Amino acid sequence: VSQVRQNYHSDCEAAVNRMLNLELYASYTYSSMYAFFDRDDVALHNVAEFFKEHSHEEREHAEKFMKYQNKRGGRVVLQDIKKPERDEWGNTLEAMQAALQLEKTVNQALLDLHKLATDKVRPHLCDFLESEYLEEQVKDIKRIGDFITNLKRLGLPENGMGEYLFDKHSVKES
Amino acid sequence: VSQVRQNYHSDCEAAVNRMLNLELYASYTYSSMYAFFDRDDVALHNVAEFFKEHSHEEREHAEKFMKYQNKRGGRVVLQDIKKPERDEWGNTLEAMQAALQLEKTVNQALLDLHKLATDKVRPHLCDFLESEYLEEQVKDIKRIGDFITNLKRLGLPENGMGEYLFDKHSVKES
Amino acid sequence: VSQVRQNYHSDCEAAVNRMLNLELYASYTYSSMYAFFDRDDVALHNVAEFFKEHSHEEREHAEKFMKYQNKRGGRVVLQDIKKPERDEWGNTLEAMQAALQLEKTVNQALLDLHKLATDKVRPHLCDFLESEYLEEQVKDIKRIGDFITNLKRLGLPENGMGEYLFDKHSVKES
Amino acid sequence: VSQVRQNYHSDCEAAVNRMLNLELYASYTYSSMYAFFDRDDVALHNVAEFFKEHSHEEREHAEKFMKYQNKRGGRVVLQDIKKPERDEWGNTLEAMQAALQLEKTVNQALLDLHKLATDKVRPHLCDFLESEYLEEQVKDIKRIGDFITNLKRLGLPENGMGEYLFDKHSVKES
Ligand SMILES: [Cl-]
Ligand SMILES: [Cl-]
Ligand SMILES: [Cl-]
Ligand SMILES: [Cl-]
Ligand SMILES: [Mg+2]
Numbered sequence: 001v002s003q004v005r006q007n008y009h010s011d012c013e014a015a016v017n018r019m020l021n022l023e024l025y026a027s028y029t030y031s032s033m034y035a036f037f038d039r040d041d042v043a044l045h046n047v048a049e050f051f052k053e054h055s056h057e058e059r060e061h062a063e064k065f066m067k068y069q070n071k072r073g074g075r076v077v078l079q080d081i082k083k084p085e086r087d088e089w090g091n092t093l094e095a096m097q098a099a100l101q102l103e104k105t106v107n108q109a110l111l112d113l114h115k116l117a118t119d120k121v122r123p124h125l126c127d128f129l130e131s132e133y134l135e136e137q138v139k140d141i142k143r144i145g146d147f148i149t150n151l152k153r154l155g156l157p158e159n160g161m162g163e164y165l166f167d168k169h170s171v172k173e174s
Numbered sequence: 175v176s177q178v179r180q181n182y183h184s185d186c187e188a189a190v191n192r193m194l195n196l197e198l199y200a201s202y203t204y205s206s207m208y209a210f211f212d213r214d215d216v217a218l219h220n221v222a223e224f225f226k227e228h229s230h231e232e233r234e235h236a237e238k239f240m241k242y243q244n245k246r247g248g249r250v251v252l253q254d255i256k257k258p259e260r261d262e263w264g265n266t267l268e269a270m271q272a273a274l275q276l277e278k279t280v281n282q283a284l285l286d287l288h289k290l291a292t293d294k295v296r297p298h299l300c301d302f303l304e305s306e307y308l309e310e311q312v313k314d315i316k317r318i319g320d321f322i323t324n325l326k327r328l329g330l331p332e333n334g335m336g337e338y339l340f341d342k343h344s345v346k347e348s
Numbered sequence: 349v350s351q352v353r354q355n356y357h358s359d360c361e362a363a364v365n366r367m368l369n370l371e372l373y374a375s376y377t378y379s380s381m382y383a384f385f386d387r388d389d390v391a392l393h394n395v396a397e398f399f400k401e402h403s404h405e406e407r408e409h410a411e412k413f414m415k416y417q418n419k420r421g422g423r424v425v426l427q428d429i430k431k432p433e434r435d436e437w438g439n440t441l442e443a444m445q446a447a448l449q450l451e452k453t454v455n456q457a458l459l460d461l462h463k464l465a466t467d468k469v470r471p472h473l474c475d476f477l478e479s480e481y482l483e484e485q486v487k488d489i490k491r492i493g494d495f496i497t498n499l500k501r502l503g504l505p506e507n508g509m510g511e512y513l514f515d516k517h518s519v520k521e522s
Numbered sequence: 523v524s525q526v527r528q529n530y531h532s533d534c535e536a537a538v539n540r541m542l543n544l545e546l547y548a549s550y551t552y553s554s555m556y557a558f559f560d561r562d563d564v565a566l567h568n569v570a571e572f573f574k575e576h577s578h579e580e581r582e583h584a585e586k587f588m589k590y591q592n593k594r595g596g597r598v599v600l601q602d603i604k605k606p607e608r609d610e611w612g613n614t615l616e617a618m619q620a621a622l623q624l625e626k627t628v629n630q631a632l633l634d635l636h637k638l639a640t641d642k643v644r645p646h647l648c649d650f651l652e653s654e655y656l657e658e659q660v661k662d663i664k665r666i667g668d669f670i671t672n673l674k675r676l677g678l679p680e681n682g683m684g685e686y687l688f689d690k691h692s693v694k695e696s
């Protein structure tokens with residue numbers, strides 16, 4: 001075993017690997033959304049950039065799990081990064097609904113990891129999860145829900161003017 | 175009697191206490207409106223913040239009446255702060271209509287106090303009311319009426335796009 | 349259920365509401381202490397201001413629980429804010445003893461919430477409590493105990509000179 | 523009559539003259555207190571300076587009534603400035619008690635003037651009194667009461683150490 005390893009479950013090590021993959025998967029989904037909104041026949045650039053920035057932050061979160069793995073004396077084991085579920089994302093509302101789901105799926109996996117860490121008696125891991133993942137997740141989920149509520153208020157999917165306005169007012173101008 | 179007390183009616187003292195309570199009540203109502211607009215299924219954050227700021231200013235007004243009471247040699251007597259009338263506020267229009275009412279109710283109580291102070295021959299109190307409460311009240315009431323007129327113009331309650339736009343343009347961006 | 353809601357107990361939601369109320373209650377108690385010490389026949393202004401600042405920080409803590417509630421997809425439910433236990437607070441020693449009790453009561457409720465969150469398996473809530481409430485509570489309680497010890501050393505309640513000196517040296521000059 | 527005179531009672535004019543004299547009288551009393559506390563066998567210099575500053579502000583208030591008189595088209599009529607009641611002021615407590623009385627006497631005369639102005643229907647005078655005299659009076663009276671309470675707490679008249687400490691902590695260091 002690694003000379004650094006202490007109080008670090010095989011089970012925890014494997015779960016960190018799975019989480020690293022899920023973050024890469026989430027990043028790739030968001031990249032796809034970026035590319036969709038950047039199409040000439042979609043053309044909602046602030047929306048596009050929102051998703052591009054989400055992609056980057058999920059990739060950074062993946063990197064943090066690689067660093068964590070090594071700090072604990074586990075071994076990073078990579079798997080294929082699955083392509084996103086969809087090739088095209090419909091409109092801002094559908095994309096945000098998919099993002100909410102994705103964030104919930106990522107959160108569930110993080111909470112699952114936290115439960116394992118709790119059962120395993122792994123306090124450093126629990127703290128890591130709380131500090132670096134769980135709060136920022138809650139905020140993300142809140143933000144996306146807020147957005148969904150606004151998109152519905154604006155009359156999506158039918159109301160194109162409403163969609164236009166969301167891109168100008170709700171998301172940062174890029 | 176307090177060594178500082180001069181020209182200060184029991185009636186005035188009691189009325190200042192009642193006003194202190196009413197300001198706390200108004201503050202708490204506005205807090206509730208803040209919380210409503212911050213819900214994920216409401217999500218009008220600039221509106222939310224407008225009400226949060228109104229809550230803070232009403233609490234400061236309460237504090238000013240405590241200071242006044244003591245400066246005159248009366249005694250602050252606190253009562254329960256009643257919870258707001260509603261748990262949920264409908265939409266921006268309904269909330270602003272409730273705010274107009276509340277501000278009118280607070281103003282009526284302030285004008286009632288001013289009349290008592292006038293009848294009692296209490297000039298320092300009259301001046302305090304004029305200087306610190308009555309003008310800022312008139313302005314508040316004007317502002318909220320203006321807002322109601324705009325919300326009606328925007329097609330509330332039905333027009334969600336209009337509601338969206340009010341939150342972006344009429345209230346300060348938070 | 350709210351579209352944002354995930355891993356958030358009815359029990360947790362209700363407990364957050366109760367805590368929001370308790371913080372408002374604590375704020376109101378401290379306001380009363382401020383007003384007492386500001387009386388012309390009490391006149392310990394730095395003491396007064398200590399309590400005024402405690403009142404403000406408890407109100408901010410209430411606001412943080414409203415924000416939390418909404419971030420998780422629970423619903424803020426407000427109740428009356430009960431008036432404080434006493435209308436008058438005796439002297440600096442009695443007031444600080446009451447403050448210690450109040451802080452202990454608030455801490456017990458926070459620890460009770462943490463236990464529920466723990467039993468419920470709610471890690472984000474546990475972290476919130478630790479980060480935003482429990483440490484700052486411990487410090488508050490320590491500070492007030494320190495003060496009580498000093499007030500006893502100074503000869504309170506009988507030693508008015510000692511009380512005078514506490515207001516000049518122990519609490520920040522306002 | 524003066525070419526400027528409008529809505530200005532003989533009664534108001536005379537009352538302004540009386541008030542001008544009373545302010546000069548109050549100034550002179552405070553001067554005497556300054557001189558007392560500056561004696562080598564009293565030697566409470568911050569106390570002394572407090573009273574010196576009160577003397578100056580009462581003289582400025584006298585000057586403001588001269589300016590007012592002329593602005594309205596009345597005529598300043600001066601009378602002797604009576605010497606203070608006492609040649610020696612005992613100690614800080616006795617002096618502050620005398621100051622409270624004096625401030626109350628000045629306030630009563632100001633309130634009496636305000637009543638006359640009210641009965642006479644003289645709104646500019648009423649406003650002047652409110653704005654320049656009545657609030658600053660209330661504050662003065664509050665401050666002195668606060669001080670009296672502290673001096674009693676400190677054990678005056680007997681407790682010389684308490685008197686010493688008041689001069690260092692309660693009044694501005696000069
Ligand atoms: Cl597809
Ligand atoms: Cl309701
Ligand atoms: Cl009591
Ligand atoms: Cl004498
Ligand atoms: Mg080795």
Ligand SMILES: [Mg+2]
Binds near residue numbers: 082
């Ligand atoms: Mg496949």
Ligand SMILES: [Mg+2]
Binds near residue numbers: 083
């Ligand atoms: Mg495949």
Ligand SMILES: [Mg+2]
Binds near residue numbers: 058
């Ligand atoms: Mg994440």
Ligand SMILES: [Mg+2]
Binds near residue numbers: 057136137140
């Ligand atoms: Mg984030």
Ligand SMILES: [Mg+2]
Binds near residue numbers: 136137140
């Ligand atoms: Mg996220």
Ligand SMILES: [Mg+2]
Binds near residue numbers: 175176177389
């Ligand atoms: Mg008394």
Ligand SMILES: [Mg+2]
Binds near residue numbers: 256
């Ligand atoms: Mg009721």
Ligand SMILES: [Mg+2]
Binds near residue numbers: 257428
């Ligand atoms: Mg009720």
Ligand SMILES: [Mg+2]
Binds near residue numbers: 232235280311
């Ligand atoms: Mg007001």
Ligand SMILES: [Mg+2]
Binds near residue numbers: 231310311313314
């Ligand atoms: Mg205002």
Ligand SMILES: [Mg+2]
Binds near residue numbers: 277280310311314
């Ligand atoms: Mg108002």
Ligand SMILES: [Mg+2]
Binds near residue numbers: 215349350351
């Ligand atoms: Mg829904």
Ligand SMILES: [Mg+2]
Binds near residue numbers: 430
């Ligand atoms: Mg009760």
Ligand SMILES: [Mg+2]
Binds near residue numbers: 254431
């Ligand atoms: Mg009760």
Ligand SMILES: [Mg+2]
Binds near residue numbers: 126474
């Ligand atoms: Mg823990």
Ligand SMILES: [Mg+2]
Binds near residue numbers: 481
């Ligand atoms: Mg707290």
